[PDB]
Short mmCIF file of N, CA and C in Angstrom, two decimals:
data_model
loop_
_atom_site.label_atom_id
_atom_site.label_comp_id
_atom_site.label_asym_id
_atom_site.label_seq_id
_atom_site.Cartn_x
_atom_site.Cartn_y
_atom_site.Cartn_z
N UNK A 1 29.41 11.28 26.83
CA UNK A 1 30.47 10.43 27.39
C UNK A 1 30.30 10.32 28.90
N UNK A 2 30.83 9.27 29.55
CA UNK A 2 30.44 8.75 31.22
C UNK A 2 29.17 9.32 31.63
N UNK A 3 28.09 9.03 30.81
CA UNK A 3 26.96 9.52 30.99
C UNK A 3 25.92 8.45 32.27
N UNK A 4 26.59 7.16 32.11
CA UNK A 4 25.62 6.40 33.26
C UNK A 4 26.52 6.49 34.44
N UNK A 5 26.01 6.69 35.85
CA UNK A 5 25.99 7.17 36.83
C UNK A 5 25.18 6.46 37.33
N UNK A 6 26.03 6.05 39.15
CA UNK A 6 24.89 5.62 39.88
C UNK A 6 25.49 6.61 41.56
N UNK A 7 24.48 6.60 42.21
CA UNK A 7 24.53 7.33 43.49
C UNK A 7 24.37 6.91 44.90
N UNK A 8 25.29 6.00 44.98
CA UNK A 8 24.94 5.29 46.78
C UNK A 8 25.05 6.57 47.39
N UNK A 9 23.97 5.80 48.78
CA UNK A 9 24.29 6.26 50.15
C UNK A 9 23.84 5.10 50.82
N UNK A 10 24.51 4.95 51.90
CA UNK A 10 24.13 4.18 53.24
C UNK A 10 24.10 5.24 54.23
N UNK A 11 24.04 6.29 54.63
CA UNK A 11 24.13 6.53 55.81
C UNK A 11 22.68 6.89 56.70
N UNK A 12 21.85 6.63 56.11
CA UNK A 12 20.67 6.12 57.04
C UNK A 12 20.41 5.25 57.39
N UNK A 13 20.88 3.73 56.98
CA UNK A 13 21.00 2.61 57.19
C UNK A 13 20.61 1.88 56.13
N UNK A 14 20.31 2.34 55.12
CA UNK A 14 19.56 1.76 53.62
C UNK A 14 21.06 1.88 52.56
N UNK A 15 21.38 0.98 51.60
CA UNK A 15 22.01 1.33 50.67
C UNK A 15 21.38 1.86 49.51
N UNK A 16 21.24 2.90 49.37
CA UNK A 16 20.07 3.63 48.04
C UNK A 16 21.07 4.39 47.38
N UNK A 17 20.55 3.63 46.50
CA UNK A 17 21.44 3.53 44.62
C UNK A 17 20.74 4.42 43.79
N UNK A 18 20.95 5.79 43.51
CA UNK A 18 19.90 6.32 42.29
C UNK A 18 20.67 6.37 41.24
N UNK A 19 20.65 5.38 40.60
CA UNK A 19 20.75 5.05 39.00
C UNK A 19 21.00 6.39 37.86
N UNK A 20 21.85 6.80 37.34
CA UNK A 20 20.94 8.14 36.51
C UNK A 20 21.90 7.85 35.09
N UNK A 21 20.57 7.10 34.59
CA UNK A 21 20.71 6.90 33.27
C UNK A 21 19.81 5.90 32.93
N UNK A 22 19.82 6.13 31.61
CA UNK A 22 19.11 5.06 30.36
C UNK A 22 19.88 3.71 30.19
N UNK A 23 19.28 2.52 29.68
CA UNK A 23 20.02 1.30 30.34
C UNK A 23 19.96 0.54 28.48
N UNK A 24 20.78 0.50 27.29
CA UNK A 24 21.04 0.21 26.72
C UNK A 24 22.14 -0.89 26.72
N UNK A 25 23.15 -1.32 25.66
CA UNK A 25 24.06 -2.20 25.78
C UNK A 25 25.21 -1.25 26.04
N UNK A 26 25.06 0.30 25.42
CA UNK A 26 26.35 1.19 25.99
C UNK A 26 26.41 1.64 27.23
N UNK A 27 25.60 1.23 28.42
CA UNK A 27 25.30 1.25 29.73
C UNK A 27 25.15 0.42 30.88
N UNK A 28 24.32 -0.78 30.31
CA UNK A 28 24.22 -1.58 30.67
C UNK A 28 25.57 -3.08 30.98
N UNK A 29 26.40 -2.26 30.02
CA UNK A 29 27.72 -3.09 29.95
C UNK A 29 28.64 -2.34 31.99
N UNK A 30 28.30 -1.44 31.79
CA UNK A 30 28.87 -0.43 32.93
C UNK A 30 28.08 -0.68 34.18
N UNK A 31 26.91 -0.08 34.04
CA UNK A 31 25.98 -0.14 35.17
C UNK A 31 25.83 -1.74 35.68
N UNK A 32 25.84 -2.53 35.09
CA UNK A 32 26.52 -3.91 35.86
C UNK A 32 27.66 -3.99 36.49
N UNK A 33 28.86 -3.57 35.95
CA UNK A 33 29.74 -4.07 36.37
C UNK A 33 30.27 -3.22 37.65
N UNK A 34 29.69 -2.22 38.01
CA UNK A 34 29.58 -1.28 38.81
C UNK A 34 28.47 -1.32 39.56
N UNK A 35 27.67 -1.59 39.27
CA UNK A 35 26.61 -2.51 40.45
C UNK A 35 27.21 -3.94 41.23
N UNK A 36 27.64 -4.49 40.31
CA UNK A 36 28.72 -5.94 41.32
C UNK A 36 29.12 -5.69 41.96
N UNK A 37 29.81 -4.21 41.58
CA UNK A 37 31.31 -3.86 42.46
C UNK A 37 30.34 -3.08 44.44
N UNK A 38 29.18 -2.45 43.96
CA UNK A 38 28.45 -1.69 44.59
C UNK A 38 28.00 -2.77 45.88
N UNK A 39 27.41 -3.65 45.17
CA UNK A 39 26.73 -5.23 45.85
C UNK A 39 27.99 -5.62 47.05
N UNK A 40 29.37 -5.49 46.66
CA UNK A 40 30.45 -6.01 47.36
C UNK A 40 30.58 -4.94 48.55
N UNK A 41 30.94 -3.46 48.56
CA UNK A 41 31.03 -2.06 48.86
C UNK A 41 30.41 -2.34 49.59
N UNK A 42 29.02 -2.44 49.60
CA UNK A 42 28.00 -1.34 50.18
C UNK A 42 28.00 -2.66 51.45
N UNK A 43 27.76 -2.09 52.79
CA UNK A 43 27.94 -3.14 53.81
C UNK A 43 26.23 -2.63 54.37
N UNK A 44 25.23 -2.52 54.28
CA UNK A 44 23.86 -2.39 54.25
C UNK A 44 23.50 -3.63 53.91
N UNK A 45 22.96 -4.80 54.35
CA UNK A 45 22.31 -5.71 53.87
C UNK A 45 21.72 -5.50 53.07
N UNK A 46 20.57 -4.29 53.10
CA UNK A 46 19.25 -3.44 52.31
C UNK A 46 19.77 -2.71 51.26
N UNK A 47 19.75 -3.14 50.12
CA UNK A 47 20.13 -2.55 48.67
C UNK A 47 18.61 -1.80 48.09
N UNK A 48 18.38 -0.35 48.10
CA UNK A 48 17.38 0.12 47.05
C UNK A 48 17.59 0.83 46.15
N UNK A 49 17.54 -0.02 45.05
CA UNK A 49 18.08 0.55 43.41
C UNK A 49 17.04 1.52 43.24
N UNK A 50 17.54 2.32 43.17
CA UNK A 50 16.20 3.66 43.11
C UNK A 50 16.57 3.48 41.22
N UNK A 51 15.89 3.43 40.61
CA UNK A 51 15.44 3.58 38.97
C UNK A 51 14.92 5.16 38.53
N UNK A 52 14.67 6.03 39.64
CA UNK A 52 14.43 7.31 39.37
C UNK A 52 14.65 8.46 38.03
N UNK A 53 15.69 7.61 37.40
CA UNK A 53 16.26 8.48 36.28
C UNK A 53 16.60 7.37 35.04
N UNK A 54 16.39 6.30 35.29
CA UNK A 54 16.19 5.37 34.37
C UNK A 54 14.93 5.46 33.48
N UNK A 55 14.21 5.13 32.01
CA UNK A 55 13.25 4.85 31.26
C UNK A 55 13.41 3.98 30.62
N UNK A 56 14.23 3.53 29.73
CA UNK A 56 14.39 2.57 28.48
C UNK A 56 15.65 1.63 29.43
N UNK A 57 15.66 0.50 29.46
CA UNK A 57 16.10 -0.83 29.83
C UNK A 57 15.61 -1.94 28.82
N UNK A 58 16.66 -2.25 28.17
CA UNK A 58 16.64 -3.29 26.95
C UNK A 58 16.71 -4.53 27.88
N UNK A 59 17.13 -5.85 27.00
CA UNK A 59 17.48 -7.02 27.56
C UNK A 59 18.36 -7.05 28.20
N UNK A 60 19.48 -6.40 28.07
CA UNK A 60 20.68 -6.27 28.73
C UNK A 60 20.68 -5.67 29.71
N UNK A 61 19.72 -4.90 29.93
CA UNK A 61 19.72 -4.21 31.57
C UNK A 61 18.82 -5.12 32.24
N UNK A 62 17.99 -5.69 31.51
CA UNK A 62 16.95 -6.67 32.61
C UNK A 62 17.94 -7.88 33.19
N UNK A 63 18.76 -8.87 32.18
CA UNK A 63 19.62 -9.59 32.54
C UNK A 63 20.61 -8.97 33.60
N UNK A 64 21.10 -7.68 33.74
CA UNK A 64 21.48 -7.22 34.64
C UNK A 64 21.34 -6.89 35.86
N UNK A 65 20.08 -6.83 35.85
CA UNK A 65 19.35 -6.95 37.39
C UNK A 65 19.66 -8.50 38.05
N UNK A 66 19.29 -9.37 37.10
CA UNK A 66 19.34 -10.91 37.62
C UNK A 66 21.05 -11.42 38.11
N UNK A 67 22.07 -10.60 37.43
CA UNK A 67 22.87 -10.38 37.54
C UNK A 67 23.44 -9.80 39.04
N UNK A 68 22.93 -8.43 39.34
CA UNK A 68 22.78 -7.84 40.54
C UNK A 68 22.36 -8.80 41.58
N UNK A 69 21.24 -9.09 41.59
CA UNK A 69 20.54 -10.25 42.58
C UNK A 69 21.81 -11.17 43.29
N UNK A 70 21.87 -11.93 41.77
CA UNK A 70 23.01 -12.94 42.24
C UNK A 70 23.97 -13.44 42.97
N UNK A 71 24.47 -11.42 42.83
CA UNK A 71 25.63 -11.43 43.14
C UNK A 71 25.57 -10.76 44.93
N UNK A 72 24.22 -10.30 45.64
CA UNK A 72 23.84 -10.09 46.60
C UNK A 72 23.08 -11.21 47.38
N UNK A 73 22.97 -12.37 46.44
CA UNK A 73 22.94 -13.89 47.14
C UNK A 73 24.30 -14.41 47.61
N UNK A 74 25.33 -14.16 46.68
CA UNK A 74 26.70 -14.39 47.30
C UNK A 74 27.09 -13.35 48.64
N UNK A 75 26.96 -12.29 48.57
CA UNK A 75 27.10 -11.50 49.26
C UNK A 75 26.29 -11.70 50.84
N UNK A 76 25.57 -12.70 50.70
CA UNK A 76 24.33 -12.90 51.80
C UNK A 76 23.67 -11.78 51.65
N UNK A 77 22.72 -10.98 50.96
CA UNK A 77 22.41 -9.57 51.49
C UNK A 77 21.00 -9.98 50.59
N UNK A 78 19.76 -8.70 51.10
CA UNK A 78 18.82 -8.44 50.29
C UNK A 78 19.26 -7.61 48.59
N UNK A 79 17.77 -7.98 48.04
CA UNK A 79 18.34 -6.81 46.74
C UNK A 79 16.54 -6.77 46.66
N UNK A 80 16.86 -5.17 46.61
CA UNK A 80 15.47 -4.40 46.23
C UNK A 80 15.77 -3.41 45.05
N UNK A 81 14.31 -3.38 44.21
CA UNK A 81 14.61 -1.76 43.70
C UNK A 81 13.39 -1.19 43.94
N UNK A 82 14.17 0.25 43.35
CA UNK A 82 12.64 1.20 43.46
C UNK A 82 12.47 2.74 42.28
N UNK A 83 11.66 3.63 42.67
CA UNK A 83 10.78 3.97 41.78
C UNK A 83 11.23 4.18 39.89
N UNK A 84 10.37 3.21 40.05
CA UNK A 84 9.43 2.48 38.73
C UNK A 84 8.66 3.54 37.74
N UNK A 85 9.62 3.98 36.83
CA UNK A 85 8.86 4.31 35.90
C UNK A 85 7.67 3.44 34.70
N UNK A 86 6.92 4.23 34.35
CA UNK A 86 5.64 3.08 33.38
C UNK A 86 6.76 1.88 32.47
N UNK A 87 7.50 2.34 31.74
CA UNK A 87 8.40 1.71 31.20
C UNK A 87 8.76 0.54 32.33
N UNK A 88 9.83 0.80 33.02
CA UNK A 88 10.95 -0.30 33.83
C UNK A 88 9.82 -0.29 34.68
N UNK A 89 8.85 -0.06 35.30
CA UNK A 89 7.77 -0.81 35.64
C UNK A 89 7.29 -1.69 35.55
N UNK A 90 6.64 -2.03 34.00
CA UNK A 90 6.56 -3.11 33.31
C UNK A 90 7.40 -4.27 33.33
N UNK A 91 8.70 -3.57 32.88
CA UNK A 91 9.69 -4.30 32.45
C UNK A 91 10.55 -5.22 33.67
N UNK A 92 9.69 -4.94 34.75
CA UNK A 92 10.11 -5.55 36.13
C UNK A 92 9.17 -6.77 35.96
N UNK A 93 7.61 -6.42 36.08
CA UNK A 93 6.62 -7.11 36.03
C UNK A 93 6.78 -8.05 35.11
N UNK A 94 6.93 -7.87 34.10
CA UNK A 94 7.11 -8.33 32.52
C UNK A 94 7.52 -10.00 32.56
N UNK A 95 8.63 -10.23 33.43
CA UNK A 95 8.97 -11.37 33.74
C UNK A 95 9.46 -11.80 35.27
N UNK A 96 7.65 -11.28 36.26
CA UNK A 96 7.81 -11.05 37.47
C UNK A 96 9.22 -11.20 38.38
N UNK A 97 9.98 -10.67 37.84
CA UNK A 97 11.12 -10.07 38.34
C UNK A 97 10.59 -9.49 39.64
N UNK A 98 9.35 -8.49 39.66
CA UNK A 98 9.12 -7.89 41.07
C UNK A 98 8.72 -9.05 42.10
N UNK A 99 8.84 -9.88 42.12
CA UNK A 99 8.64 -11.11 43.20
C UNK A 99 10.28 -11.81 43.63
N UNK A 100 10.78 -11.55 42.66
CA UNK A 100 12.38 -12.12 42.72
C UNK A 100 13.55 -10.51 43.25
N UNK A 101 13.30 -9.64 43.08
CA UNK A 101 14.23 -8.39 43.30
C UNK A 101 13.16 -7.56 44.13
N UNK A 102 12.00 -8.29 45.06
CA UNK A 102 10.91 -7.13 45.03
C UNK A 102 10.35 -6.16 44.37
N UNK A 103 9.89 -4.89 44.85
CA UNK A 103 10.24 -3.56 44.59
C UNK A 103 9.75 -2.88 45.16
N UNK A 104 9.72 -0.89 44.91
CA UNK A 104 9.35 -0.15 46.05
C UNK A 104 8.40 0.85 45.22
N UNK A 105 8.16 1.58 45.87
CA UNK A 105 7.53 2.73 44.84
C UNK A 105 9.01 4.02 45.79
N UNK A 106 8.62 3.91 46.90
CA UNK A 106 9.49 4.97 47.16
C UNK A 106 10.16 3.85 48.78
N UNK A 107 10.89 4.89 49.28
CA UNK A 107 11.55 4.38 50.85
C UNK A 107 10.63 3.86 51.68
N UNK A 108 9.60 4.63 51.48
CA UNK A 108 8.37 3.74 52.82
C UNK A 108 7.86 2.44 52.45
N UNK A 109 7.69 2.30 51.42
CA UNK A 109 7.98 0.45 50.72
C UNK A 109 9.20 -0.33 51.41
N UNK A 110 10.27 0.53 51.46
CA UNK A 110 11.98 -0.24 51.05
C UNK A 110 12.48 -1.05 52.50
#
């Protein structure tokens, strides 16, 4: 139960998000709507979705990223993510998403 979790900080000047969870439809329903809310919050232009504890991301978490984006185009702001497991690696690439949300491997990318 309240197993997806995400972890801002801004106070280095980066908004870095570490994600910690698996991204299904029982997550992915959350971790969106709490990423919108995050996108609004976070006053960092520089959003890095750290994926660190993420592996499995269905359709519903990929649509959720595009989702995220969107809503940091309204916001005027960047949207990045970062480290990429082999899985959500792919699944970035998959439908070069990494050209549209970037991405990082770690902070010295971001």
């Amino acid at each position: 139960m309240n197993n997806l979790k995400l972890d801002i900080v801004e106070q280095d000047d980066k908004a870095i998000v570490r994600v910690q969870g698996d991204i299904d439809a029982y997550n992915s329903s959350e971790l969106k709507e709490q990423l919108r809310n995050f996108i609004s919050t976070t006053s960092k232009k520089k959003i890095v979705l750290d994926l660190s504890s993420v592996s499995y991301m269905d359709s519903a978490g990929l649509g959720t990223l595009v989702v995220i984006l969107k809503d940091a185009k309204i916001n005027g702001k960047e949207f990045i993510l970062s480290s990429l497991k082999e899985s959500i690696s792919r699944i970035l690439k998959l439908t070069h998403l990494d050209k549209i949300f970037k991405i990082t491997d770690t902070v010295e990318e971001a």
